[PDB]
Design a protein around this ligand. Structure first.
Ligand SMILES: CCC[C@@H]1C[C@@H](C(=O)N[C@@H]([C@H]2O[C@H](SC)[C@H](O)[C@@H](O)[C@H]2O)[C@@H](C)O)N(C)C1
Ligand SMILES: [Mg+2]
Ligand SMILES: [Mg+2]
Ligand SMILES: [Mg+2]
Ligand SMILES: [Mg+2]
Ligand SMILES: [Mg+2]
Ligand SMILES: [Mg+2]
Ligand SMILES: [Mg+2]
Ligand SMILES: [Mg+2]
Ligand SMILES: [Mg+2]
Ligand SMILES: [Mg+2]
Ligand SMILES: [Mg+2]
Ligand SMILES: [Mg+2]
Ligand SMILES: [Mg+2]
Ligand SMILES: [Mg+2]
Ligand SMILES: [Mg+2]
Ligand SMILES: [Mg+2]
Ligand SMILES: [Mg+2]
Ligand SMILES: [Mg+2]
Ligand SMILES: [Mg+2]
Ligand SMILES: [Mg+2]
Ligand SMILES: [Mg+2]
Ligand SMILES: [Mg+2]
Ligand SMILES: [Mg+2]
Ligand SMILES: [Mg+2]
Ligand SMILES: [Mg+2]
Ligand SMILES: [Mg+2]
Ligand SMILES: [Zn+2]
Lengths: 206, 122, 53, 112, 122
RNA sequence: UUGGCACCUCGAUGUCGGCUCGUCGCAUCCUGGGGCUGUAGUCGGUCCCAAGGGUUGGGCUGUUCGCCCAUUAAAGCGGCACGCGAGCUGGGUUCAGAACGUCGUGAGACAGUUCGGUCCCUAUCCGUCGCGGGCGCAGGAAAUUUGAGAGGAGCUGUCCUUAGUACGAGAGGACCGGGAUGGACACACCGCUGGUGUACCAGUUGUUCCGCCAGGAGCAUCGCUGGGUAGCUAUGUGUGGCAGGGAUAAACGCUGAAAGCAUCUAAGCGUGAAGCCCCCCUCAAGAUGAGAUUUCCCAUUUCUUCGGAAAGUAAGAUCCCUGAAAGAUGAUCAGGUAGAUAGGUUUGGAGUGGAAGUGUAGCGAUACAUGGAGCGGACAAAUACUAAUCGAUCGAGGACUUAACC
């Protein structure tokens, strides 16, 4: 199981050798370093901690500087753990390049979905509108809060509230191209998040 | 992108001039039919002396739509109108002639007799 | 629609725990010697504490 | 995006001629019929050209057997053997959607 | 871009009014939201002024108000805001790339607590 | 269900059907497993286990119901104030008008019909969905996390092959296994196809204005019309429910006595469901049981008999300011000259479609050239020109006991 951290650059399309045209997400994954290895003896579980993008000194504090000094590297914007990896691979301070993947590798992409702010039940939960005419005064409303008997509302009556900005995993995206000199992965289809969003690419759990 | 109540020109030689879509086939709640899909339909306008008569409930394959079709190569095809061809339970047309162009998608769905009779297959 | 019970003094006072003003963000100027909002012009001197006008 | 431009640059077909909406073009389109690959000519007026770089598409309209047919292509698709501009049309706009509601004579584009 | 509690046409009128005021008076007091919109519009008028040619003068003329700034006296002819923008204001920013305005924060207005600012050329 | 009773409510517990939103039971409609069959096969019948998910769109009628059309794997039956009117509707019913049949001498009335007919309310509390502030968590901090526990998901068709094999006199026609491809549903995203796009580009009418012409501006739904960027989007695209594992239900067995036999059961072994627990996705240490790892700061001053107190600080954080990928506000995240955070500027790009001025041709409307021109919100990159100045505020000094090393 291999893993890397990249930024979503954007979407485009590529023609396959076949001739088919496929949509791709461009993930730029430069400056991934191995910062720490967690073992069962020390931490209670196997994981490798990867630091992604380089960050100006004045944006880092002394606690951060002390943690990346152990891996002889500069402060890092994003630090994430990968579990289910082989710790025998990964030396502390080693770069992690996008060539840990190959064209045809099936990956899971994890990121935070775009923020839509306060949203109603129609957009947030795909509920149906009431009629728009025939005397209706019920358009974009949540529906009955429930029956009478329990003198209260059950605990998953879906209602308006803040919509996106959740963690999302898309499973089984094909890697379409790996460009090491550009530190670029091309992934078939889309991954969560706005442009410039952290994307965690790891080998498909399935 | 044809649904219940969508009317369609009949692109063939059988009596039917205009059909009304009664049902998109192939799924419990299937909303929409595309090029190459078979619909159940009623004949709303007939040609006097034709084989297929007004009020007859028939099956028809959609052979061109305004909502066209995407192809794997990333190209699309769209027609100026929605037309269908009345068929038997074997995918053969009730008519002897097909009028107007017909989408290549028919050849893939195995409507070979229709593809052969069509003046152009785009 | 309407209050079922009047609100007690305690409950009213708890609700107002957060109904308050914050102190303004201010500090003494060097040239003036008197208080001013940060990132504002100081009227005592009559200009921006740093940039003369 | 400059990085997406660099990555896609290699897939830009340089054989693509200069054409505008209003031009009559002849698309030599590859067609995989049964097993053997075939060239089907599609000749019509360029109705629309939209997008940028590898994502740029154009649409060609023709009347086939008294039915308007529109064919939309990626500009840089390798499934177009050859695109030749047959005549240069005199038009006043980028999108000739008005042609969708005109039949013969009324739908004529003046040649330049 | 900011909607300043106004419809589209009201907002264009407001921007043209304030843009002209800043060109004519060179220093105005307004609300922070208005100033943050005015800097964009005034800096583009000064850019036109620096371009200097007839096409740019006519683009500015479509925006700037027909206001008299002063009456100068050779006969005494009036000077129009457009003339001030092309002859007085623009030429004094000939060696300055952009950043023709500055916003000084002032303090809240008594009647509505609106945060007021000075916006000035320089 | 039709009823019986009259116990709560007449200083009001809104009553049918529908819409929205569901949730529960299982007496199971489908899908899963199985026994018997008057089970050859394909289909079925009947019973047992099984509530995970699923369970259509129309015609008629206020309807519920029901019949019908066309589908579907299937079109389950019930409960929740015949669920849900401070959520909607208001067709029916149950008001004042009017009329018909009928009854009544009449006023009027109905085992009846008909046309028409005011649906109020700013949410206090609990509850539900989101989002902050406080304190806690025996020092103060910055990150990375474990997962007790919770939520989500859970559906299914057709075709090909196995095989025209098994089975059958034929007609017909499989299990099991392998593949492909759908429907419905969900999540993400805008490259594509489209939608929108009220500070983008163009055309155009009327009238007023800019002194006039030219060129522009105002108002007429953004005047109208044709396009359209970013953003937001579905009807668009990508992906998912894969494959498992453990223990079981009904059931099938093995060994096996009680009961020299027999017997799946008593001791003891196995098989065995879409179900249970995992696996998958998300939240999660206020998990007060307040967990773990890495890193940072250190043991200051004056008082307090005493315990402790207060007052400068460290690491760090905030106020304030520039903002957007974030957003009701807080919050979050990107920045604050240790500077590309925003605006401007310069160069691009999309988009529009050929500016103005000038010239040429034409009697002229206009055309052509200069010239893919000019314009160009929100997109890209560079650039410190403008503004993120200058300040201030908060924030440790680590209790006791015992054990183990020591
Ligand atoms: C078969 C019916 C049985 C009775 C119904 C109920 C009652 O009287 N409802 C009132 C209601 O009028 C309005 S709703 C228009 C009021 O808002 C509502 O609160 C309420 O009073 C009215 C409809 O008659 N009774 C308690 C029992
Ligand atoms: Mg947002
Ligand atoms: Mg609906
Ligand atoms: Mg309304
Ligand atoms: Mg209760
Ligand atoms: Mg207007
Ligand atoms: Mg009694
Ligand atoms: Mg009462
Ligand atoms: Mg049962
Ligand atoms: Mg009706
Ligand atoms: Mg009821
Ligand atoms: Mg009701
Ligand atoms: Mg109610
Ligand atoms: Mg009588
Ligand atoms: Mg009535
Ligand atoms: Mg309300
Ligand atoms: Mg309240
Ligand atoms: Mg709990
Ligand atoms: Mg799109
Ligand atoms: Mg678009
Ligand atoms: Mg006008
Ligand atoms: Mg004029
Ligand atoms: Mg007027
Ligand atoms: Mg035995
Ligand atoms: Mg087992
Ligand atoms: Mg299943
Ligand atoms: Mg930038
Ligand atoms: Zn001062």
């Amino acid at each position: 199981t291999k893993g890397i951290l990249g930024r979503k650059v954007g979407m485009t399309q590529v023609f396959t050798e076949n001739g088919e045209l496929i949509p791709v997400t461009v993930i730029e994954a430069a400056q991934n370093v191995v910062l720490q290895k967690k073992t069962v003896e020390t931490d209670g579980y196997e994981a490798v901690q990867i630091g992604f993008e380089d960050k100006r000194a004045i944006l880092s504090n002394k606690p951060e500087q002390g943690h990346v000094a152990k891996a002889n590297t500069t402060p890092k914007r994003f630090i994430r753990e990968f579990r289910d990896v082989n710790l025998d691979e990964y030396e502390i301070g080693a770069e992690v390049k996008v060539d840990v993947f190959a064209e045809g590798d099936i990956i899971d992409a994890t990121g935070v979905s775009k923020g839509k702010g306060f949203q109603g039940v129609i957009k947030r939960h795909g509920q149906s509108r009431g009629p728009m005419a025939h005397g209706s005064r019920y358009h974009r409303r949540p529906g009955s809060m429930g029956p009478v008997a329990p003198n209260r509302v059950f605990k998953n009556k879906l209602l308006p509230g803040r919509m996106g900005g959740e963690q999302i995993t898309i499973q089984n995206l094909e890697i379409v191209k790996v460009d090491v000199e550009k530190n670029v992965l091309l992934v078939k289809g889309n991954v969560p998040g706005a442009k410039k969003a952290l994307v965690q690419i790891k080998t498909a759990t399935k | 992108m044809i649904q219940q109540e969508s009317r369609m020109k009949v692109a063939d030689n059988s009596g039917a001039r205009e059909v009304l879509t009664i049902k998109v086939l192939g799924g419990s709640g299937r909303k929409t039919a595309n090029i190459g899909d078979v619909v159940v339909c009623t004949v709303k306008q007939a040609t006097p002396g034709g084989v297929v008569k007004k009020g007859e409930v028939v099956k028809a394959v959609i052979v061109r739509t305004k909502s066209g079709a995407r192809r794997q190569d990333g190209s699309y095809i769209k027609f100026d109108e929605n037309a269908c061809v009345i068929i038997r339970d074997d995918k053969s047309p009730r008519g002897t002639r097909i009028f107007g162009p017909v989408a290549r998608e028919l050849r893939e769905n195995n409507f070979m007799k229709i593809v052969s009779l069509a003046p152009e297959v785009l | 629609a309407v209050p079922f019970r009047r609100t007690s003094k305690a409950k009213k006072r708890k609700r107002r725990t957060h109904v308050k003003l914050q102190l303004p963000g201010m500090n003494e100027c060097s040239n003036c010697g008197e208080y001013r909002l940060s990132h504002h012009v100081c009227p005592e001197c009559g200009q921006y504490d740093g940039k003369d006008v | 995006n400059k990085l997406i431009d660099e990555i896609t640059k290699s897939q830009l077909n340089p054989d693509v001629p200069n054409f505008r909406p209003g031009d009559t073009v002849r698309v030599h389109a590859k067609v995989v019929e049964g097993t053997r690959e075939r060239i089907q000519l599609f000749e019509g007026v360029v109705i629309k050209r939209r997008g940028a770089g590898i994502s740029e598409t154009f649409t060609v309209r023709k009347i086939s057997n008294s039915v308007g047919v529109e064919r939309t292509f990626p500009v840089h698709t390798p499934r177009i053997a050859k695109l030749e501009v047959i005549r240069r049309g005199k038009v006043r706009r980028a999108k000739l959607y008005y042609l969708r509601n005109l039949r013969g004579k009324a739908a004529r584009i003046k040649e330049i | 871009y900011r909607k300043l509690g106004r419809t589209s046409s009201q907002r264009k009128a407001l921007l043209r009014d304030l843009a002209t005021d800043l060109i004519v008076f060179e220093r105005i007091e307004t609300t922070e939201a208005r100033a943050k919109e005015i800097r964009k519009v005034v800096e583009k008028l000064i850019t036109s002024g620096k371009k200097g040619d007839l096409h740019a003068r006519r683009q500015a003329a479509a925006f700037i108000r027909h206001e008299v700034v002063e009456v100068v006296q050779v006969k005494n002819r009036p000077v129009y805001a457009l003339q001030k923008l092309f002859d007085d204001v623009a030429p004094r920013y000939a060696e300055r790339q952009g950043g023709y305005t500055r916003i000084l924060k002032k303090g809240p207005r008594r009647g509505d607590g609106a945060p007021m600012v000075i916006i000035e050329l320089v």
